[PDB]
């Protein structure tokens, strides 16, 4: 362990649905500081190599926001588990029905956003719907003011298990590169719980190791974000918990 013990496992079905090549929607309805807007987005997922391509595109005009900072709000279902950590995989052994993901994602010296979202199956897409909201900005911050850098660094979650809730929870500290030379901080307190009543798998600790890559796509004409990315879970003894 090390923020939580985990209470057994003993639910594997989800796990069978991600050995393939899975299509991915995703769907954010967001308000920051009164601005409104809405953002699509659809890929690929291939958990076997915990690899997803995703783009997406605001709908409703210009982004409000920094396309970085919603990158972490925009399916860790589609992380690598390795199979002596296959017992500690919370996000598939919720599957079809899937889960409630939650966070408060705190920008340093600036506003903050607060997301609710439900991650499942729809057909055989994996959808991520999202409802957003923003406060307390500075109109001249970073974030609305568009200062960070369209890229995005390497970064590990922590994973706990939340007994008390039949799901899991995760902090950890994003690094956005401000174009001033510095780095724009946001905080995100996260926290996961069932859609359903089956059972699910409580995990030992453990965290993501996550790599991101962005890029845009010269023909589009929308404001758009490409994302490549690699997760895989890690940080388990072989045969154990902790």
């Given at each position: 362990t090390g923020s939580r013990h985990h209470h057994h496992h003993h639910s594997r079905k989800?796990?069978?649905?991600?050995?393939g090549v899975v299509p991915i929607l995703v769907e954010l309805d967001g308000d920051v500081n009164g601005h409104k807007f809405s953002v699509s987005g659809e890929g690929e997922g291939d958990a076997t190599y915990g690899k997803l391509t995703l783009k997406f595109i605001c709908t409703t005009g210009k982004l409000p926001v920094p396309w970085p900072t919603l990158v972490t709000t925009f399916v860790q279902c589609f992380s690598r588990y390795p199979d002596h950590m296959?017992?500690?995989?919370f996000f598939k052994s919720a599957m079809p029905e899937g889960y409630v993901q939650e966070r408060t994602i705190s920008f340093k010296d600036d506003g903050n956003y607060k997301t609710r979202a439900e991650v499942k199956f729809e057909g055989d897409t994996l959808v991520n719907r999202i409802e957003l909201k923003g406060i307390d900005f500075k109109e001249d911050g970073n974030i609305l003011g568009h200062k960070l850098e369209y890229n995005y660094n390497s970064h590990n979650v922590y994973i706990t298990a939340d007994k008390q809730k039949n799901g899991i929870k995760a902090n950890f500290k994003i690094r956005h590169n401000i174009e001033d030379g510095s780095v724009q901080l946001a905080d995100h307190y996260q926290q996961n719980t069932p859609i359903g009543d089956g059972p699910v798998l409580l995990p030992d600790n453990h965290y993501l190791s996550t790599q991101s890559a962005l890029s845009k796509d010269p023909?589009?004409?929308?404001?758009h974000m490409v994302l490549l990315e690699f997760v895989t879970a890690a940080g388990l003894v072989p045969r154990g918990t902790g």
């Amino acid at each position: 362990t090390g923020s939580r013990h985990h209470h057994h496992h003993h639910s594997r079905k989800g796990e069978e649905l991600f050995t393939g090549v899975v299509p991915i929607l995703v769907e954010l309805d967001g308000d920051v500081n009164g601005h409104k807007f809405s953002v699509s987005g659809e890929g690929e997922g291939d958990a076997t190599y915990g690899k997803l391509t995703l783009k997406f595109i605001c709908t409703t005009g210009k982004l409000p926001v920094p396309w970085p900072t919603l990158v972490t709000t925009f399916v860790q279902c589609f992380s690598r588990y390795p199979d002596h950590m296959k017992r500690h995989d919370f996000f598939k052994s919720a599957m079809p029905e899937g889960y409630v993901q939650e966070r408060t994602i705190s920008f340093k010296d600036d506003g903050n956003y607060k997301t609710r979202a439900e991650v499942k199956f729809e057909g055989d897409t994996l959808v991520n719907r999202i409802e957003l909201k923003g406060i307390d900005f500075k109109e001249d911050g970073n974030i609305l003011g568009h200062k960070l850098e369209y890229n995005y660094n390497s970064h590990n979650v922590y994973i706990t298990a939340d007994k008390q809730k039949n799901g899991i929870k995760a902090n950890f500290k994003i690094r956005h590169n401000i174009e001033d030379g510095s780095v724009q901080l946001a905080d995100h307190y996260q926290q996961n719980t069932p859609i359903g009543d089956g059972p699910v798998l409580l995990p030992d600790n453990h965290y993501l190791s996550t790599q991101s890559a962005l890029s845009k796509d010269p023909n589009e004409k929308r404001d758009h974000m490409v994302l490549l990315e690699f997760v895989t879970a890690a940080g388990l003894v072989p045969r154990g918990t902790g």
